[PDB]
Write a protein that binds this ligand. Structure first.
Ligand SMILES: Cc1nnn(C)c1-c1cnc2c3ccc(C(C)(C)O)cc3n([C@H](c3ccccc3)C3CCOCC3)c2c1
Length: 126
């Protein structure tokens, strides 16, 4: 039974920044469309294991990720490569399948968001 760890870093002000067509698309298209999905809301902030009473969440999940962090990272130009952002979305879905069980409501929500994520990433420019 533990408290929550601090959330992931969202700004790297000592690293150089770039705006690419790919990075604009990940924020204005991928993140935006997923954020407004009917089942997006549990993924918009880190898992609060104390409020939700999940004492084993951060014993099982050592690489947590959520769309609130991804959004703040894109808004702060944290990513230099679009693949770093894609990896974050993948880690987020993967954690949900590691912690939860087949047929759980949260897993069906992750499945619906991942299908939409693949549809949007399919159309990534360049
Ligand atoms: C767990 C888990 N594993 N991966 N993720 C992303 C989660 C995850 C992340 N955030 C929330 C979350 C945030 C706010 C609320 C509030 C407080 C407003 O009621 C409920 C929340 N639940 C629910 C839940 C609670 C406890 C155990 C499992 C599920 C889901 C919600 C969808 O409908 C089913 C219950 C979450 C589950």
């Amino acid at each position: 039974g533990h408290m929550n760890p601090p959330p992931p870093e969202t700004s790297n002000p000592n690293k150089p920044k770039r705006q690419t067509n790919q990075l604009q698309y990940l924020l204005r298209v991928v993140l935006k469309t997923l954020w407004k999905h009917q089942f997006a809301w549990p993924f918009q902030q880190p898992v609060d294991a104390v409020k939700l009473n999940l004492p084993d969440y951060y014993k099982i999940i050592k690489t947590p990720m959520d769309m609130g962090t991804i959004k703040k990272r894109l808004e702060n130009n944290y990513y230099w490569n679009a693949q770093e952002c894609i990896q974050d979305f993948n880690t987020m879905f993967t954690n949900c399948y590691i912690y939860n069980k087949p047929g759980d409501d949260i897993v069906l929500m992750a499945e619906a968001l991942e299908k939409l994520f693949l549809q949007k990433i399919n159309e990534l420019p360049t």
